[PDB]
Structure formats: C-alpha cells, structure tokens
Write a protein that binds this ligand. Structure first.
Ligand SMILES: C[S@@+](CC[C@H](N)C(=O)[O-])C[C@H]1O[C@@H](n2cnc3c(N)ncnc32)[C@H](O)[C@@H]1O
Ligand SMILES: C[S@@+](CC[C@H](N)C(=O)[O-])C[C@H]1O[C@@H](n2cnc3c(N)ncnc32)[C@H](O)[C@@H]1O
Ligand SMILES: C[C@@H]1NC(=O)N[C@@H]1CCCCCC(=O)O
Ligand SMILES: C[C@@H]1NC(=O)N[C@@H]1CCCCCC(=O)O
Ligand code: SF4
Ligand code: SF4
Ligand code: FES
Ligand code: FES
Lengths: 312, 313
C-alpha cells in the first residue's frame, strides 16, 4: 500500500495551522466516533533503577531526580490497583516496568499479572522494554492485548536523546509483538530538542510500517530536575497541537493518545488536541512517576466538551 | 421578508456537543468567508468619562467609582492624529466612541468633520455615539461613516438587570435609523454579565431575526472593573465564550463575528478556538476604549502562528 514521502509530510508541518486542524477533524470524523475518547490508566509494575540513559526520563539510574526506587510489586499489589482502576472507570490497564528487557525469572509473574487483569474484565497492555520472540508469544498466550514501545523521535536524532539502544533495536521489538499477535502502541515525545523535521521523521517512521500502530501516543516532554533535558525550552502549545494533527491525518485508522504532559496543558489546548484528532488519554492522579490531571477535572472537562456517556 | 430562527431552535445549539458545534461552525464559516483572513479595526474614545447611563458593566458610567480620568471630547486633529498612527499601524477601520447617551447638535459639525478626515485618510470610519436620530444619522452618512455601533448586550428579558436608563427597544430603533440611513450596522453583546445560556440565546436570536442582521457582530467577554456592580463576578468558562461565537457564526453566516473586548484576558488557544469557531474580526492595539488590549506585536505574532493574513514583515 502507498506510504508517505518526507517532503510530503513536511508539507503538513508547514500548512496554515488552523487549516491543518480542519483537515484533521475532517479526517478524524471519517474514521472515528468523535465525542468518544479512549481511557487507559497505567501504573508502574516496577519503577526506579533503570539501566538505559534517556535524557528525558526520571527513572534513569543515570541521573539525580531523587526518585524513591521501588521493586517489582506482587501480583496482588498490581491486580489491586488494577481493580480500583477498573471500578474507577478505565477501559485498559497499562503496567510499565523500568527495564531494558524483561527477565525469564520475571515472565511467570508478568504472565500471572496479565491473567488477572484480563479476567478482571479490562484490557491488558504492558511496556517492559525489548521483549523477545519467546517472551512475546508468552505474554500473548497469557492475554496481553497491547504492547508499548516508542520511537521517541527521528532516527537521525535518537542519538542525542537515547544511546543505550539502537533505533532499529526497537523497530525489531514492534514486529516481534506484531507477529506475536498483539496490538502495537508506539509513539514519541515532543520538545526533546527535536525540530519540525525530526518530529516529521518520527510520524513518517511509525507511519510507513507494515501496519502502523493501533495506538499512537504523543507525549509532551516532562522536564524533570536532574534529567539532562530538565532545563529546556517549553514547546508552544500550538506546536504540540500540530503534531497531533499530522499524526491524525497520517494514520487515520489509528488512535492518537494525548498523553504525558496533559497536566501541564490547559483546558483549551486539550480541546484543540481532541479536535486535532487526539482520542485517547491516561486517566488518573499519576501515570508512571509524574503528575496527571485528577479524575474529576478530567471527567468535568470531558463533559464541558461533551465527550462520552460517562456522566453520573 | 425571510425565515426566522425559533428559540427552541437556537437553544438546540447551546446544548449541542461543543466540539461538534465547533465543527459545523467552521463548516459554515468556510462557506461564506476566506478563513485565515481576519478583520482588523482599531478604535479610540473620541470622548470618555462622565457618562449618564448606568450600565452595570461599563467603567465610564458616572454612576460608579472605577476612578477613571475623565477626559473631554478631543479636537478633530487629536482624533485624525491617532487615526493616522493607526492607519500606518496597519488597521483597516477606525472606530471613534463617545461616552454619551445621544450626540448633541453642537457636536455634529465636529463629529462630521472627524468622519471627513478619517474617510479621506484612506480607512473605514465607524463611530458609536449612542442613540443618534434620523437627522444625525443622515448627517453622519453624508459625511462618510461606514459603520455605526449599537449593542443589545443581552436578552430583552435581562436587559433590565444590567441597563435601565434605556429601553431595549430604544436601541433597536436606533439600528433601523442607521440602516435606512445607508450605514453598516455593527451590533453585538457581552457575555458573563450574569446572563444564562437562555439569555445569550435570546441575544443572538434577537439581532439575528432582524430586517437584515448586522454586518459586524461583536461579542465581548465581560471586563470586570473594580467599581462597576459586576466587578465581583464569576468568570466565564472559556468554552462558553467559545460556544457563543460558534452559535453566532452559524446563526448569521453572512456576518463578521468580531472576537473583542476581553481578548486580553483570553489565552492563545482560546482565541484560536474562537477564530476557528467563526470569529473573524478583532480590535488591534494597546487599548480599546479604556481597558487593556493585547499589544500589536503579540497580536501580529499569534496571527502568524495560526497563519492568518499576508501581514508579515
Ligand atoms: C514510561 S516509559 C517505559 C519505557 C520502557 N522502560 C522501555 O524503554 O522499553 C515509556 C515512555 O514514557 C515517555 N516518558 C517517560 N518519562 C517521560 C518524561 N519525563 N517526559 C516525557 N516523556 C516521558 C517516553 O516516551 C518513554 O519511552
Ligand atoms: C464602548 S461602548 C459605547 C456605547 C455607547 N455609549 C452607546 O450606548 O451606544 C459599546 C459597548 O462596549 C461594551 N463594553 C463596554 N465596557 C465593557 C466592559 N467593561 N466589559 C465588557 N464589555 C464592555 C458594551 O457592550 C457597550 O455597550
Ligand atoms: C507508558 C506511557 N506511554 C507513554 O507514551 N507515556 C507513558 C509513560 C509516562 C510518560 C510521562 C513521564 C513519566 O513516566 O513520569
Ligand atoms: C465599541 C466596541 N464595541 C464593542 O462591542 N466593544 C468595543 C467597546 C469596548 C469593550 C470593552 C470594554 C471597554 O470599552 O473598555
Ligand atoms: S525510558 Fe524506559 S528505558 Fe529510558 S530510562 Fe526510563 S524506563 Fe528506562
Ligand atoms: S456602555 Fe456606552 S452607555 Fe452604558 S455607561 Fe458606558 S458609555 Fe454610557
Ligand atoms: S500505553 Fe498501554 S496502550 Fe499505549
Ligand atoms: S466597532 Fe467600529 S465596526 Fe464594530
């Protein structure tokens, strides 16, 4: 099937914002039920001491960021929080480990977790890093509906942010999950230092794949004292907007999840975003380790804009 | 004569799922206007201060504190002066605004003389002097005046709680005087005076079901001013000041909806939402009549971020 050239995507990032937003909606409405948004709540199955060196992450053992390092929680502890989240109203549960790759000793537990979450009635999706053909097929057999694995940016920039991994090294993991028979959730971050071109490259990347990701998160950089990116220039909202617009147009059939950084965004913006095409969010006090808009505020905005039949 | 919007037909909109409403909005707007293109009018207060009327929201009302340096009508030069700096400044239409109930015959020669200079200076001329009368209108028109401002502020069924020194009708009368005069009508209202979804509805529904709805339809957001009885008021959720523009856009396609008064209080995104909503005119400058307004640069800058106009240098 036809793909996207780069000088074909840069076109968008250059298009008159407003007009782009229009096409955006135009598209979105042709493939999704507007006023309807996807709600996934996640927790950190295991947080803290992390090997890799992402210039943006606060869990990287490579930096200060004084983070209370915790150790993988028992299957109960997970299913516990999983429950409060189901009842809390979320549809999909997202466990996230702070690893490079899971360990064989882990699997039995990771597996056991998906079990409970899958039977509990909600969707199960975890992000454990680079899993391998074996692990995948195991997670899939257990249940896991989705797997998270981001590209963060253009391959031509991945270097300035992440080094402990091959840009390719990730692509490989997606396909492992693809063939595994699990849904792929892949996305990036905005405002790492990247440029209009870089971002372009990112979408352009996970866009020209065998079968683009079902869910495409677009996080806005969460500056954290310690991480080398901490002291960074904030991204004009309008640019974090446009990014969603492009993504929506570029992958119609895909769920664009306005995530990470909503807490920093204002009402209107999120509105702009949803309009832009964004149709999924993380719902809750916190996501992995940073702050997130509180359930109520979320629920309240959800209605102001008139999204969902989740009013009581 | 043509069709008229029912009320239970407009309340429908104010109830419609915001986002979806915004869509129709744009849908409509694009069918009657050149998006990415916005109208720029800059105004000044030909005469400010001591005002007779008692609008619960206005800071010029002689009825309240608001410590406003009361100034007296400026000479024709003083006006044309500021008028010039504003033309060069890049604005298209000039808007003089007096703080009167109605102009005085002694005024006219000067008001007339003003329109003269502004009209010849090369830009559009529009002034708001209150309730002018058949005579005055035809005089202003003969001089040049392209537009006349006269707002309805809200539903007739609420006008009372805000304004009392005038008959809701008393204004309608003035519009028509201007209509027949052969001048463009700029009529609009304010949001967040205390009004309710229904009230607002009534407002649009009002100036919407007229002989020929106003070319320009301003929609000001209430500017709380210490002193005015409205000062201590609940702020209006942006999303509601948004929706209001949406409805107006749909309800009067052929009309210019001017996002005005209160932009200074609004944030980037909102104005964006607004323009998208249908809003396509603004007041450009440091100040409008007496409150603060976003500075030319900030304006020009946002204008480009969103990609509006060929006004880039
Ligand atoms: C919570 S992590 C877990 C990643 C997993 N350990 C791996 O690397 O396989 C998933 C994504 O969260 C995003 N993220 C984490 N911390 C962030 C921050 N402080 N600011 C912005 N995005 C962040 C990054 O895009 C990251 O790849
Ligand atoms: C500058 S005034 C002059 C009106 C003129 N004297 C008349 O009565 O015909 C025009 C409109 O500005 C709006 N306005 C003035 N002050 C305002 C404020 N503080 N907040 C919101 N709107 C205001 C009101 O709708 C007012 O009728
Ligand atoms: C795993 C989820 N997928 C994603 O793209 N972002 C979430 C991770 C958290 C991002 C915000 C920074 C933090 O983790 O504290
Ligand atoms: C005359 C113009 N028409 C209108 O609706 N607003 C302008 C007047 C100013 C509104 C904001 C409050 C002030 O006057 O300072
Ligand atoms: S992002 Fe994933 S890999 Fe990079 S440091 Fe944080 S947890 Fe480890
Ligand atoms: S709004 Fe126009 S009329 Fe009402 S008090 Fe102020 S100047 Fe006088
Ligand atoms: S993180 Fe679980 S689906 Fe995107
Ligand atoms: S105020 Fe002069 S045109 Fe609306």
């Amino acid at each position: 099937r036809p793909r996207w050239t780069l000088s074909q995507v840069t076109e968008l990032f250059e298009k008159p914002l407003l007009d782009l937003l229009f096409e955006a909606q135009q598209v979105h409405r042709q493939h999704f039920d507007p006023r309807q948004v996807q709600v996934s709540t996640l927790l950190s199955i295991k947080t803290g001491a992390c090997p890799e060196d992402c210039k943006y992450c606060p869990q990287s053992s490579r930096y200060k960021t004084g983070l209370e390092a915790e150790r993988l929680m028992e299957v109960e502890q997970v299913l516990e929080s999983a429950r409060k989240a189901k009842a809390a109203g979320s549809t999909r549960f997202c466990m996230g480990a702070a690893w490079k790759n899971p360990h064989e000793r882990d699997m039995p537990y990771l597996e056991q977790m998906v079990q409970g979450v899958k039977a509990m009635g909600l969707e199960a999706c975890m992000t454990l890093g680079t899993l391998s053909e074996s692990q995948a097929q195991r997670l899939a057999n257990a249940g896991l509906d989705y797997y998270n694995h981001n590209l963060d940016t253009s391959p031509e920039f991945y270097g300035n942010i992440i080094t402990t991994r091959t840009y390719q090294e990730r692509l490989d993991t997606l396909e492992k999950v693809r063939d595994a028979g699990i849904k792929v959730c892949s996305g990036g971050i905005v405002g790492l230092g990247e440029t209009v071109k870089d971002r372009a490259g990112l979408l352009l990347q996970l866009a020209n794949l065998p079968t683009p990701p079902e869910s495409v998160p677009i996080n806005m950089l969460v500056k954290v004292k310690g991480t080398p990116l901490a002291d960074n220039d904030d991204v004009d909202a309008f640019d974090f907007i446009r990014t969603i617009a492009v993504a929506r147009i570029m992958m119609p059939t895909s769920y664009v999840r306005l995530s990470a950084g909503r807490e920093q965004m204002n009402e209107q913006t999120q509105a702009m975003c949803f309009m832009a095409g964004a149709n999924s969010i993380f719902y809750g006090c916190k996501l992995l380790t940073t702050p997130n808009p509180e359930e109520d505020k979320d629920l309240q905005l959800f209605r102001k804009l008139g999204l969902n039949p989740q009013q009581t």
